[PDB]
Amino acid sequence: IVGGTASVRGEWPWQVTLHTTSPTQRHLCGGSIIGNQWILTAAHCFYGVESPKILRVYSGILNQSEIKEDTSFFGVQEIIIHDQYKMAESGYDIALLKLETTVGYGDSQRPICLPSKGDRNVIYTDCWVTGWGYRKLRDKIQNTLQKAKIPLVTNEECQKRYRGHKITHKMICAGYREGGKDACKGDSGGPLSCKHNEVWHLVGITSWGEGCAQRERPGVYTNVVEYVDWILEKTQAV
Template sequence: VFTPNLDYCRIVCTYHPMCLLFTYLPATWTKDPAKRFTCFLKDSDTEILPKVGMAGAISGHSLKQCNTQIRACSMDVHTGLDMQGTNYNITTADNYQQCQKRCTNDDNCYFFTYASGAFHSADFRKKCFLKNSRTGTPTSIRLLNNVVSGFSLKPCQLSQTDCRMDIFQETTFSGIDLTSVFTPDSFVCRTICTYYPNCLFFTFLTREWEVETQRNLCFLKTSRTGVPHARVERENAMSGFSLLNCRRSFPACHSRIYMDTNFLGDELNVTYVKGHKACQQVCTDKVRCQFFTYFPLQESCNKESKCKCSLRMSSDGSPTGIVYEKGRISGYTLRLCKRKASTVVGGTDSLRGEWPWQVTLQVKLSTQRHLCGGSIISNQWILTAAHCIDNLENPNIWRVYADILKLSEINEDTPVFKVQEIIIHPQYVTAETGYDIALMKLDKPMNFTDLQHPICLPSKEETNIIYTNCWVIGWGYTKEQVVLWNVFL
């Protein structure tokens, strides 16, 4: 593949299912200019390769086994480089930042080139070229004056387009098929789609699918419009979208264990361990292992009560087949599961209008302070938690603010609502025992705008949808030990 620098070569190697090592030929490579910017991805049965002297070449290892968070994000831009691919969209832009933003918010864009106002051809000055390729990387890279190239910032969680996390049951999506792989469930299928070049949506066929040879197949799909050509109701099928547009990261790994399941693949090694967790750890520690099957049945165990652990791999990182067999336990390596701990501290800064139903509920006693969040459910009612009202049942002490991104924005001129009535669920006692819900009636109706309106709720007709993820929104610290008034929604 071609990459603009060494760091991106290593990123590509890290996310390739088989790449362990790489060699990169930089811009200064003189032996064969046509091979400049080439990134050679390499594998080895022994997990090492002999070192051969090659002046100007740079080699290194995949980061798969590192104990730090691994990200596919590349925010670098490359002046004087034209990253070539399919130019499917050409527009005028004032600067490369505008061009990169367009690429980030376009479903089909993986990289871009921007020609500045000083470009030699007047027809292409200040033009933004949105590009893609079959591999998601440039098809070649050339030196060219007065251009800037870079990648989409979708992997950096900076897309401002819709994050579609619903999985639709009994549904198939039609589109352009990219490839298909075997996966044990729709969630693994979705993760693979998220990291597979050009995959925008997928369809997964369950183990009950009518055609036996197609059971557990995950079809990765795309379209020129970014949405499925059609949605068709089919039993034992599930469909969904890539999560690349989402404003939070999802690790490129699968941590779940699958009982009574045998993952087929090329046998790397067989060892004996106590328990499927130990088997998964052995797979994680062995750099070429991609998935495993553990055999806890008596005939597969030795005198030390250690049972057979088969370490396996394939060319695409997915099982070559999935068989349901009693007593077998299967799973994947955890080597790409490293991620920062999820805490309320930090989180992701919101954009104005991103959560227009969120309000800050503040108590005014000797001073005024933020106490809880709430959600607009109608023009005069706010939904919140009952525990927020504990010992504060007097409506007169509450103040409600909408369209607030940063708490320090609030001043005496900020529009505010008072509370006329508070209704606590009659069965609420403590948060731990349930029924932790309350309503606040505003003293006057709220005018709805794009920045303040009721929460989006599914209609009663929306059934057969599995909701697997949720957003927690509110005001919290941007980092440890900062002042409360410097926090963001």
């Protein structure tokens, strides 16, 4: 997160840190708890990941330093990548992780509400991107979970900012015209959480951008409202 600020413990209880074990254990990406065994995240996070066995999901974490060999985690049973996914820049950058065990909800960890089909028309004014990613282009994984408030940008505006790319209605953009606050390397797969009628909704999933926080280069996020039926298909399968 560029131009962000330290989060406080329990501010984003749906946020998770996804670690890979190969070759050495490290933070890979963020994700969001959406159900008792479901983490929603970005598809591009698994490029090169051959098996779920090398993955560890940590919840209720403010600081990466809370993670050591004796820290409890959730094993991944299944990696579900959307069938249409090819690359972040082309869309369908969404994935689900089915956990080997059930998340016990509490004040440190709980789900974020998915957006409603009847809310695709509403305009969100209170949007935040969160993660442990770089604070600048050549930096490192941050210890403390960062937050940054960013304005949603219309698709028409985002399309002007990205000549040569096709910004679809399955993508949602966020950024200040002058730059300064954005997601960066290590933030992908994490949430763009928007507060509406005193309830937080998972509006976006960090996906891509041209550099970090550049002027007239807003962040591009998966438009979660457009994938609610896909999530229900995978999570409510008979």
